[PDB]
Design a protein around this ligand. Sequence first.
Ligand code: HEC
Ligand code: HEC
Lengths: 127, 127
Amino acid sequence: QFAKPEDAVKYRQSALTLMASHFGRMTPVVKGQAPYDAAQIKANVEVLKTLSALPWAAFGPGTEGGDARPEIWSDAASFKQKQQAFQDNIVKLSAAADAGDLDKLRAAFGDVGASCKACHDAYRKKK
Amino acid sequence: QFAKPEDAVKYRQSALTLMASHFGRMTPVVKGQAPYDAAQIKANVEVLKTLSALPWAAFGPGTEGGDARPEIWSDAASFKQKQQAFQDNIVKLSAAADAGDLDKLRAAFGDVGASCKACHDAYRKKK
Ligand code: HEC
Ligand code: HEC
């Protein structure tokens, strides 16, 4: 869907920006600093689930650019493992949110965050 | 979920960027220049549906900025009518996509596009 590589870059950066907001806005809830409304969080994690599937298709071959490391394309199977693992961590968060289980939510949230960081450590250039 | 107005601006611009991609990538399909796979389009319009609900919450009061016109906030009921109407046009597109009906899809796509433009004409500053 991208006329030039720059369009892919813009897409993925936007997708990741939205993910970051949908993930990060729950931080006060998991910390107890904001109240836990099970329905609010269920709906939000549904949005996060949708969004968390989107960036990967915008790292198609030849879409080098932005702060993407070239290892994304050298190493296809390893990058795919990291995104698929990340999406599976999102599944655990969805399960927690759907159950209305705050303890499972906290645990899953931590694991998701670790997965974001593991990918960045391997595949995102320093700012 | 926004620490400063700039964060709201960044969010909505990203949401609208993703909408534009999910909408616009169907143009060749509705024109017949690319093949119509009913399942592909159904899935894509589901993503568009999710995305099309997101920008509006990021025009909360005091989040002036970007290319948003101030009339968004003077005139709340009129802006809300335009976004809700737009989302209802997305419902028609969803119905068409879910039915696998290409003629309804074409018609709905046109109406959606007109709705994007009607909002821009009233509420988005010139580049
Ligand atoms: C690889 C499997 C990743 C996972 C999982 C997550 N992120 Fe990431 N992120 C990744 C890359 C390769 C990049 C660079 C993209 C580019 O082309 O520049 C990013 C970037 C971000 C950004 C910055 C986006 C921008 O505005 O330019 C953000 C805010 C971000 N990532 C957040 C984020 C969060 C919160 C994640 C888990 C919920 C997450 N990322 C996972 C690669 C990967
Ligand atoms: C009002 C009810 C709108 C509807 C419906 C649509 N758009 Fe829009 N758009 C609107 C505003 C007020 C702005 C400015 C946002 C800001 O703070 O700057 C925009 C902007 C866009 C953009 C640019 C985003 C960016 O990268 O800065 C795009 C690509 C865009 N809009 C596309 C778009 C499409 C394709 C729409 C229908 C499917 C659509 N918009 C509807 C207001 C409104």
